[PDB]
Design an enzyme around this catalytic site. Structure first.
Site, PDB file in Angstrom:
ATOM      1  N   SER A  49       0.818  -1.255   0.000  1.00 15.89           N
ATOM      2  CA  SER A  49       0.000   0.000   0.000  1.00 15.89           C
ATOM      3  C   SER A  49       0.819   1.256   0.000  1.00 15.89           C
ATOM      4  O   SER A  49       0.243   2.321  -0.113  1.00 15.89           O
ATOM      5  CB  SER A  49      -0.982  -0.015   1.193  1.00 15.89           C
ATOM      6  OG  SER A  49      -2.088  -0.885   0.961  1.00 15.89           O
ATOM      7  N   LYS A 213       3.162   6.574   4.906  1.00 17.73           N
ATOM      8  CA  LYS A 213       2.187   5.639   4.368  1.00 17.73           C
ATOM      9  C   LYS A 213       2.679   4.241   4.565  1.00 17.73           C
ATOM     10  O   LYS A 213       3.781   3.889   4.099  1.00 17.73           O
ATOM     11  CB  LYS A 213       1.923   5.888   2.878  1.00 17.73           C
ATOM     12  CG  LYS A 213       0.908   4.924   2.262  1.00 17.73           C
ATOM     13  CD  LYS A 213      -0.541   5.189   2.715  1.00 17.73           C
ATOM     14  CE  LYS A 213      -1.446   4.019   2.380  1.00 17.73           C
ATOM     15  NZ  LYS A 213      -1.333   2.974   3.441  1.00 17.73           N
ATOM     16  N   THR A 214       1.856   3.414   5.159  1.00 18.96           N
ATOM     17  CA  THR A 214       2.201   2.021   5.420  1.00 18.96           C
ATOM     18  C   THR A 214       1.837   1.097   4.250  1.00 18.96           C
ATOM     19  O   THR A 214       1.050   1.459   3.361  1.00 18.96           O
ATOM     20  CB  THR A 214       1.472   1.498   6.668  1.00 18.96           C
ATOM     21  OG1 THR A 214       0.045   1.713   6.476  1.00 18.96           O
ATOM     22  CG2 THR A 214       1.886   2.287   7.917  1.00 18.96           C
ATOM     23  N   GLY A 215       2.403  -0.111   4.274  1.00 25.35           N
ATOM     24  CA  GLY A 215       1.931  -1.159   3.370  1.00 25.35           C
ATOM     25  C   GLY A 215       2.065  -2.479   4.047  1.00 25.35           C
ATOM     26  O   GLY A 215       3.035  -2.686   4.777  1.00 25.35           O
TER      27      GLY A 215
HETATM   28  C1  LIG Z   1      -5.046  -2.589   5.684  1.00 26.32           C
HETATM   29  C2  LIG Z   1      -4.706  -4.028   6.035  1.00 26.32           C
HETATM   30  C3  LIG Z   1      -6.010  -4.837   6.257  1.00 26.32           C
HETATM   31  O1  LIG Z   1      -4.017  -4.478   4.872  1.00 26.32           O
HETATM   32  N1  LIG Z   1      -3.558  -5.785   4.712  1.00 26.32           N
HETATM   33  C4  LIG Z   1      -3.632  -6.105   3.412  1.00 26.32           C
HETATM   34  C5  LIG Z   1      -4.114  -5.096   2.401  1.00 26.32           C
HETATM   35  O2  LIG Z   1      -5.138  -5.153   1.711  1.00 26.32           O
HETATM   36  N2  LIG Z   1      -3.235  -4.008   2.285  1.00 26.32           N
HETATM   37  C6  LIG Z   1      -3.484  -2.988   1.330  1.00 26.32           C
HETATM   38  B1  LIG Z   1      -1.990  -2.561   0.779  1.00 26.32           B
HETATM   39  O3  LIG Z   1      -0.860  -2.819   1.696  1.00 26.32           O
HETATM   40  O4  LIG Z   1      -1.750  -2.577  -0.676  1.00 26.32           O
HETATM   41  C7  LIG Z   1      -3.155  -7.408   2.819  1.00 26.32           C
HETATM   42  C8  LIG Z   1      -3.187  -7.886   1.451  1.00 26.32           C
HETATM   43  S1  LIG Z   1      -2.557  -9.344   1.403  1.00 26.32           S
HETATM   44  C9  LIG Z   1      -2.203  -9.504   2.927  1.00 26.32           C
HETATM   45  N3  LIG Z   1      -1.657 -10.634   3.556  1.00 26.32           N
HETATM   46  N4  LIG Z   1      -2.547  -8.420   3.790  1.00 26.32           N
HETATM   47  C10 LIG Z   1      -3.863  -3.926   7.309  1.00 26.32           C
HETATM   48  O5  LIG Z   1      -2.615  -3.817   7.209  1.00 26.32           O
HETATM   49  O6  LIG Z   1      -4.441  -3.895   8.451  1.00 26.32           O
END
Ligand SMILES: CC(C)(O/N=C(\C(=O)NCB(O)O)c1csc(N)n1)C(=O)O
Length: 268
Positions: A49, A213-215
């Site tokens: 993200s 911004k986290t990911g």
């Molecule tokens: C926002 C939330 C739910 O995110 N966790 C995710 C997700 O959808 N992240 C969105 B992003 O990092 O592109 C994810 C995708 S596959 C995986 N394993 N985790 C989180 O960090 O709490």
């Protein structure tokens, strides 16, 4: 700071990486001097993200030439929602304005908001084109949310390097690629981020304001990018990418915060 402290910090990043079953990509830049503390600066990592910063900047850049864009409403329905839509799910029907979608994707990491903005721009290649236009020849966005989080080892889709992303964050947040007003707006949105309290923010002093911004993704991928603003001192860029050897590993907030702390202490 000193060269000696920066070298010692790079050794402490090696030691930190030895403590977990994965890899650490790290760049911190003290913009007073351009000094760098790095680990695996030129390896590709799945950015997950953290790309939402580049996405939002591309939207802001398009709004500089379109006075109606930021207030344009984009309607969407409940069936359009993708997984993890904490803000957009509250506004199905008439939807949200483009500016509200930027704020939602940046501050809550909302995935429907991201998908709506990728589509507005013309698809993932428009985000890659925007990155190229600000001098980032490394970043690539190939897929949308949530498939871009697969983080498969060896897969170059939806990746960048720590060095490339640190230069782009610096240009977007500290330089004026968005123009002074847009730059202020992107900074304000990321300063108000709700998802980063255990990451870079947990590694810096209380007086440093962090626009980040986290990911998070598969393979325990745990990232955070941004800029810390110590009071009355030049800003410091932080890019932290981590990813694990096992597909179902957990992300490690504590390792991200530790990596940030290593550089914050070396530069301060
Ligand atoms: C926002 C939330 C739910 O995110 N966790 C995710 C997700 O959808 N992240 C969105 B992003 O990092 O592109 C994810 C995708 S596959 C995986 N394993 N985790 C989180 O960090 O709490």
């Amino acid at each position: 700071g000193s060269h000696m402290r920066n070298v010692a910090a790079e050794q402490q990043l090696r030691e930190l990486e030895s403590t977990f079953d994965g890899r650490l990509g790290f760049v911190a830049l003290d913009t007073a001097t351009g000094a760098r503390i790095a680990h695996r600066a030129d390896e590709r990592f799945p950015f997950c993200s953290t790309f939402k910063t580049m996405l939002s900047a591309a939207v802001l850049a398009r709004s500089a030439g379109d006075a109606a864009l930021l207030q344009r409403r984009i309607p969407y329905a409940k069936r359009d929602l993708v997984r993890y839509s904490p803000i957009t799910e509250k506004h199905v029907g008439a939807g949200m304005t483009v500016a509200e979608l930027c704020a939602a994707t940046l501050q809550y990491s909302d995935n429907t908001a991201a998908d709506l903005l990728i589509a507005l721009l013309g698809g993932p290649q428009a985000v890659t084109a925007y990155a190229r236009s600000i001098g980032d020849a490394t970043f690539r966005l190939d897929r949308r949310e949530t498939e871009l989080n697969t983080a498969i080892p060896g897969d170059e889709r939806d990746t960048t390097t720590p060095a490339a992303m640190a230069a782009s964050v610096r240009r977007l947040l500290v330089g004026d690629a968005l123009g002074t007003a847009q730059r202020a707006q992107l900074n304000a949105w990321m300063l108000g981020n709700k998802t980063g309290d255990a990451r870079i923010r947990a590694g810096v002093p209380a007086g440093w304001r962090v626009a980040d911004k986290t990911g998070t993704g598969d393979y325990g991928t745990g990232n955070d990018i941004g800029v810390a603003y110590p009071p009355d001192r030049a800003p410091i860029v932080f890019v932290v990418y981590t990813t694990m050897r096992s597909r179902n590993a957990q992300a490690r907030d504590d390792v991200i915060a530790s990596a940030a702390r290593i550089a914050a202490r070396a530069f301060v």
